[PDB]
Ligand binder design. Sequence first.
Ligand SMILES: [Mg+2]
Ligand SMILES: [Mg+2]
Lengths: 604, 608
Amino acid sequence: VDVIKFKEPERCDYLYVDENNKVHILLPIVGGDEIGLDNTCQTAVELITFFYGSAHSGVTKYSAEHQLSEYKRQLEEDIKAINSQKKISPHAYDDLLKEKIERLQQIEKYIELIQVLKKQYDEQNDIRQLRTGGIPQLPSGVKEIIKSSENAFAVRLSPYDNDKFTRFDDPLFNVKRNISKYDTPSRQAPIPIYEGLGYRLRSTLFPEDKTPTPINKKSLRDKVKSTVLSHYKDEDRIDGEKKDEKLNELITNLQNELVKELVKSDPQYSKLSLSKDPRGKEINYDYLVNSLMLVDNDSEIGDWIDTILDATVDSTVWVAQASSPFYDGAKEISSDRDADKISIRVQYLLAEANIYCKTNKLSDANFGEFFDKEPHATEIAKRVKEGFTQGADIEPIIYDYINSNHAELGLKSPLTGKQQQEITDKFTKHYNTIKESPHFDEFFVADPDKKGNIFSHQGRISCHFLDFFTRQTKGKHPLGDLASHQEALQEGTSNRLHHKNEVVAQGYEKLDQFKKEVVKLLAENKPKELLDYLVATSPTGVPNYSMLSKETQNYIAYNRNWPAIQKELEKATSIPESQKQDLSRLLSRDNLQHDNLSAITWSK
Amino acid sequence: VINMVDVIKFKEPERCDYLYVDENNKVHILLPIVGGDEIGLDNTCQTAVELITFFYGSAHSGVTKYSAEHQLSEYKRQLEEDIKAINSQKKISPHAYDDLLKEKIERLQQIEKYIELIQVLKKQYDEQNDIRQLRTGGIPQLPSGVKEIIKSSENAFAVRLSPYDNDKFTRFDDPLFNVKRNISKYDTPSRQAPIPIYEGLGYRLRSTLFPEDKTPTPINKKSLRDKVKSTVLSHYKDEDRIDGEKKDEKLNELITNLQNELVKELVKSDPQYSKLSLSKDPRGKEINYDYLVNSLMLVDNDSEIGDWIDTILDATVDSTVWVAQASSPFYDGAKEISSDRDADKISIRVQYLLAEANIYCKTNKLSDANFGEFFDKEPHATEIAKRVKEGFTQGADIEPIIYDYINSNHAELGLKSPLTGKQQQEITDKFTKHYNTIKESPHFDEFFVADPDKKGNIFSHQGRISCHFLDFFTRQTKGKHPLGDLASHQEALQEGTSNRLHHKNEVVAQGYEKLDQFKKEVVKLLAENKPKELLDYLVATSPTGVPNYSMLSKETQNYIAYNRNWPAIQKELEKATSIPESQKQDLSRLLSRDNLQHDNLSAITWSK
Ligand SMILES: [Mg+2]
Ligand SMILES: [Mg+2]
């Protein structure tokens, strides 16, 4: 069957091809996008798979070397298939061919580099250990990349039952920890320390006397209703000779309280009003009591509030933001496990705020060091405890405490409301991502929208393989043709790399676009244009007719107006002799050296 | 004032409230029923709000919203300004913007009719004050024409539920799903408290979930991991150990039982996990006694079985396995049901799930039955409430308890066949999305739910759930006012691919984009120095037959007329084989300065 089936896929594990067709291999540190999903004992998993392959959920994952070798094979099949057309068309697929050869040569080189790294430059067993080590460690080359990153940072926290086997040793945020159960003879329970942030959060939120902490979280509507009702008494009524005036005071107070509470989340609500119905009708006694017949002189202030709200406010208004991880539906903190959970949350917020400041160049301090100290450890725990009882927003309690201390945290200036909302959104997203982690000791957090040495690619947080290779080889194996490739990846728009390679895919779409142009220019019977199209050259100077294949050759040769096309060819003057004779072979059945190009296909 | 600048600023926006222009440039006005996409955000007393605004405008959050009539009149004005601007170029170029002009005029003429139809609907055909009452005299009703559209719909349905504190002012009167309700507080002298009926689904759910003796119902929801742990641990005892002769054999049974249980439970969500194995770590190393105890040093003789389990899981399973589904609305973090209000909340969820299952069957033509009628009846009301109660105390998934109860009674619910697992998961996903959308409603009495992915007379547009204004107009005027040129517009919208209408109008937008592309072609064809192509391009026509040079404006006329190539261009235009007299003459007026009748076209601009 005379069809070329192109095999080069548009996606391969660990491989990013940039717009300039430079091939980059991304060494993975841990799995994830911005926050790492692997930690503690499993930190090494990605690296194990990269260097050695592995079995995940009884489905085999192959090494980078295996996968790159397979991609090489496919490129060679593609190249050999293109070359088979050269006896028919000397210029067949010239751009696609060169781009494929360019990638093949780079990939071979990367295969060589991985090989020499494992064979020659692992005398300390730093990579081998991934495979033999009881609980493996990050190779030092990766530890150094981490240490020098400007855009990715580990944080270390204090869960009650801490795991000794943390694997990120340069965290930005770091707090005191219990003695892991694994550093006790029987390995069963941690040995608690009685100082620092972790302890103060746990001991305060669920105390040794077992007194629960109530969580009194109110929806917006409930929060506004009750607040307003607080300045009233159970016996209060909208009755009397002062009823209209009392209804007015209620309307105004409820309006003030609804607005004030709405405005913090969206100041569009600054202009919301409760004095009137959508249809313009005035919210007064006669309307609600004698016309709508909903409340009366004997109604409670709460039932007047309900009625005011239902008659004047749009349902849109009551739609909640996303929830804070701090409020997950629980009525109370009623067990050491609940307290530990919430302690971790607080700590993780403070770690996100620390990352935020570090990555935006506002501070290099370790916020943990400060919050572990007294009275801060204690004060922050009490204000958070009080927050849950008020049903208040937890994040601003942390931000106000940071801001009342900004200089001591290394910050020239307090955090603005806008910077606060950005931290909250990262914290919320990142936390929701890792909240079913079996261990909260540690996370690595990367921002691929900033300049640096760490990247996001195919669900892995990664660095450039060449960064790693150079560090681990100490400069002793120069990179030849790949010496500028690491620098080239920095020059891209973003550290967030696309999961597929568009430059590979476009090498197929261009062959499809060429077919469309040809089918159109023939259906439109404009033969001079067809010839100009074919002879028109791409940026590299290659003629479009390079992209002929069985289908396009047959459309042209057997078309209606081929005689018309052939007249133009002979009588053209501007088309060089090379290409007249070339097109004539290809498109004229009468040509001595006429032959059929193969069909071409691929997987989309 | 004479800071006049020779530039046409097009005013027609690409978006206008209530207005959808289809790919054939037919204008459609969408009459809104309630706000929302699939599930209506308005209900009970506020049901009429969209209609209030459509016909009369209204003030919301102290921002004015204008009537359809006002907004279409403004759009008409903008269209006329664009038409007059285009026309002013005609003395310079007879064919200036011929396609855009025509498209704009077409839209204008249709928009004027719709403006006329609304006016006449209000002046002539509101004798019973059906539209008027939106503005007046009590909590307004949907107008009868909208109710009939609702009654007729194949793709949208109201559902009516039983909250403890019910609001009598429901406003959807043909619900698919409907259950018995308390006597609203508003049907009592003092207006303060409902009168509870003590029969039906609602009652049984509330009374069962938090009983009159005030005993809490524990909600024992576990993580997948905790659920697997505790289960496996149930087959064990506090003093069971992995020692000491037979340790290796006992370790192996734990692995198997843990593996079977992890798999049994994961497979229910993704059968890619059928082949998961706890038998070796990622690097192929065997999970045995010597490895966890002597080498890694993580557990020993005396460790509890629960700690062996932790260690097995931690050494074998990837963090991804533990990533839970989005939650069910049923499990919202609470440890128990411990107040009438908690029970009322959960009762409404159960009810709303059953209403979705009902909508799904109706929508896919599997049943016309009212599921509420069946679930209000004993023993069904009681039994389904008990099974949901047991479910919560087990930490079981609530949705399948409902589906299995439905399937054990499928015939009686008008179903040929039980609901398949796939159909079950489609119901759960709609229920989850829709419930989450309305879960802060002040009233749960009723909701209108539309599926704009199905064939029917209800649509989604601009965050409104809507019907075609012509559907309404025809019904409300009882056929007496012929639609004239719009007589096929309603059918045309049916012929479209989806009832989910795009919020802006691409046909309007593309009328600007085509002037931009024309510019690019021109700037390319000149920089590449290809004179015959440029001429060819200019002289080539769109589908309507209009030549591309209709799209010249100051910028492109000047690019051509003062380019290097111009004498080269002019020469080609004269050797002139292909081009008809009339067009040779135009292009020459337009592009040659020596031409007697040479004049400058205006620049053109628009807001993106
Ligand atoms: Mg461990
Ligand atoms: Mg009401």
